[PDB]
Amino acid sequence: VRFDEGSYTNFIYDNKSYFVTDKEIPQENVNNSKVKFYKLLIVDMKSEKLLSSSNKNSVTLVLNNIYEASDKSLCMGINDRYYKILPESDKGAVKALRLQNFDDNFVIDKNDSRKIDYMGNIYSISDTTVSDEELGEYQDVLAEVRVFDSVSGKSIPRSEWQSRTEWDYGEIHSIRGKSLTEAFAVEINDDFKLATKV
Structure with missing residues (x-):
């Protein structure tokens, strides 16, 4: 050993x-x-x-x-x-x-909606697709919405719904062959995107 x-x-x-x-x-x-x-x-x-x-x-x-x-x-x-x-x-x-x-849960970052907090680390949600063959174990579902400044990532409160972007956040899955600490997949609108540690 x-x-x-x-x-x-x-x-x-x-x-x-x-x-x-x-x-x-x-x-x-x-x-x-x-x-x-x-x-x-x-x-x-x-x-x-x-x-x-x-x-x-x-x-x-x-x-x-x-x-x-x-x-x-x-x-x-x-x-x-x-x-x-x-x-x-x-x-x-x-x-x-x-x-x-x-710490051991997934939370959309309060300051930048394009980021996710997990295990004391911050993860950036990319515009890279995670294919079905790369998609692994179901971890959680967010089922959240953020409307945010397209450039800065700062969210806009629902009571006020500058360029704006809406992301609808779905399931989180592991990526096969990677620890969650390394990377995971986040459902954004209609496809899974790669999230990696920043």
Whole structure:
């Protein structure tokens, strides 16, 4: 079991790539260990960067063994809990382990309607289409409207409905092969657009 440099979620085991998910497994559903290992990581909660010693905004993670669960999925001991692990082919479909366990929703940015806030990051909604083959897991639906200044992105209150643009925001989906932190798809009017971290 080898974690990628600088990562607390992405690793290789028995020559296959996995990540630790945010899916907790109750202790009663955890069965035989499959791999014994012990790794301590220190993670800055703000920058999510690895540290060599703890600080005021750090969390210490003890990663300990891989187990088979009662549904034959695999999981990993993380501190006092167990979290399912999945192949990297599933990234974005299922969220990676959240540090906060030891912000996680989509909100149209209050200052610029062409942006979405997610996980403490800001995402720019592009004019690039996400094809049906790139479109992955359903995450949420906004079902919102913004009427905004076409140049500045500043929204206009409904009571007042300068060039103006109306966007009608639909579903949010993962993009296959990408974590949600990297990118996701947002339904704008009649098609899915690519949103990427700014």
